[PDB]
Amino acid sequence: WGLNNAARADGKLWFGTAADIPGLEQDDRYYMKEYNNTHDFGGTTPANIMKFMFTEPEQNVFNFTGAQEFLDIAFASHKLVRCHNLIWQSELPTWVTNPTTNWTNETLSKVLQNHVYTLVSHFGDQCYSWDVVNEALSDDPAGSYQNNIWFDTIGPEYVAMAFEYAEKAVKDHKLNVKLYYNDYNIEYPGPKSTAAQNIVKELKARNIQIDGVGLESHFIAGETPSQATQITNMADFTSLDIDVAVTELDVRLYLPPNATSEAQQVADYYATVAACAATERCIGITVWDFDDTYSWVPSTFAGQGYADLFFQPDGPNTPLVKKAAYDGCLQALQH
Amino acid sequence: WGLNNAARADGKLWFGTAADIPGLEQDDRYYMKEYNNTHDFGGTTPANIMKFMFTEPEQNVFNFTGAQEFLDIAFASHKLVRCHNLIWQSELPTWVTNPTTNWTNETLSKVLQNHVYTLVSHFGDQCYSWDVVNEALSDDPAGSYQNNIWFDTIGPEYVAMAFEYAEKAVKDHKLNVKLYYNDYNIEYPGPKSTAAQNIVKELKARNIQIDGVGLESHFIAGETPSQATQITNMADFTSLDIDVAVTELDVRLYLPPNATSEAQQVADYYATVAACAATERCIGITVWDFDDTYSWVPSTFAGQGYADLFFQPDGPNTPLVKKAAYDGCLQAL
């Protein structure tokens, strides 16, 4: 009996994990045995291979092969897939970031429309959902839109436009795919979360399809919002007639871990999973991979790590060790 | 003079160990020196390579290569092999769990029949025994049959069917292999042990061959049933005209070990081995690997470990340290 059995018993669609597949994880049989363990993982998100740079490496030149390999592996384990992501400021290919001729509103708009429409149409219902727009909101000032190539060239309309053309792809192909907005620092009440809610309100007002908000939940042990804080935040989103999902959960510590910070980690994993369990329209929890060996954390957040549910004391391709944080997740679904 | 010497001097067929071979353990020269030490280990069980997903990776397409490497290694140190296992709910290949069509009673009954018969026929007497059905009983409610693809699609008859077709292979090829049912939480009196005894009774009543019951004996220090509790439980099984074996013994602790919990571990290894020693038809003791470095426990139970007879304080590829629990096993023999 694992996290996915427990989540589905609570009415959730999955307990899930991201995976950096295709990639070196596939050569780690201890990793792959647990990735394939449907008791723990009934959902998954590709950590990289479905992003803009890998799926449209040159303008109008689409590449689906690595993404299809990820989907094939996920299907073999009966995992529902959160496809991720279409429009994002980061990890963009050079033909977008350094064009020989400046983009205009017209020409970048068509780039955006083509990428969104092609990816959603091509993969169809192999995706449970798409993260259509990723991290459109700024941290400073918290409420505002973040400056990026899409916003600077198209204006704030680029967000509605992405969902509009994702909806066109779903209707033109009679798809069931859910359309999500996904962001971080929107897991607690505050200007950024309220701004995300306003995005949902404005799309709903324009009759543009939006089905859910993804709450990334990249947290630091002891800074994570309390369970009660996440419960009320989730309610604010779901009151707008949408689902939410915890989409990229990990709880990083300042290295090295100690007894106190490890206890904080268990508490913070518990609080996040418990808030989702308490929320009727939180459809699931996905961790941003489950094995410290392959976690993105040390590279993105200097001096931090130990953020996942398992680790390998002897490195890649050696046995996993289940952390107490795992039991925090399990207890949150049982309680 | 080691555990297998002592067990064989007491009339047992072996003291044994599981090993996850082929695999990482083969690259640890200190692990393999002790694995190959027939003074300690005269029996062995493959932890994974003989399971369904490795031996029939696609339908009717068998792969015996990994299993034969294990058997060859076992043969090199004169080990009797408990082949493990034929029919089990877990770790089935995606052609069984995610099929195009949906299985029916008939099409699954033939998958089961085919898997059991060709595996038993192919390996013949390279196997001392087969765990023909593994863990067919539920924990909740304890007495009941476990729900799985076999039980759901075929019904409870799938257990008798698996032994029937294993018996067909031993009859056709005149084999000596023993047919075992293997389960956990049947090492003490209770609804689940009674349910396992009822399986034996049912098979015997229908003239279907069943030679033994495997008592997995995955225990927690301090929760292990007393030696006397195991002695009665074993007697309930052997009274049905079968053997028993302690098949997957380990005694895990909440980390870190302390003086009390380690003394409990020694006492619990002693109790289990002594109960087998006291039981005429308990044919041997197998531990579920012998080196903490490679034990299944830490991947499965958070904050638990230290379950095995040896460990490596300095990690893989460094010398083993023999734990007090080893002397408990030896004293019981």
Ligand SMILES: *[C@@H]1O[C@H](CO)[C@@H](O)[C@H](O)[C@H]1NC(C)=O
């Ligand atoms: C996990 O599943 C994938 C997809 O079928 C497979 O390629 C891989 O070998 C599996 N790894 C295991 C079971 O360790």
Ligand SMILES: *[C@@H]1O[C@H](CO)[C@@H](O)[C@H](O)[C@H]1NC(C)=O
């Ligand atoms: C498409 O991607 C695959 C793997 O992701 C790569 O091997 C191949 O070269 C790519 N083809 C292109 C970009 O035309």
Ligand SMILES: *[C@@H]1O[C@H](CO)[C@@H](O)[C@H](O)[C@H]1NC(C)=O
């Ligand atoms: C554990 O780490 C935290 C974060 O660096 C620190 O505040 C705390 O003092 C540490 N506890 C110890 C070293 O006992």
Ligand SMILES: *[C@@H]1O[C@H](CO)[C@@H](O)[C@H](O)[C@H]1NC(C)=O
């Ligand atoms: C253990 O025995 C096997 C089988 O003959 C052999 O491959 C391996 O090298 C041995 N290792 C030792 C004795 O350390």
Ligand SMILES: *[C@@H]1O[C@H](CO)[C@@H](O)[C@H](O)[C@H]1NC(C)=O
């Ligand atoms: C030893 O560990 C056990 C199991 O966690 C615990 O109950 C007991 O208090 C410990 N005894 C010590 C530390 O002396």
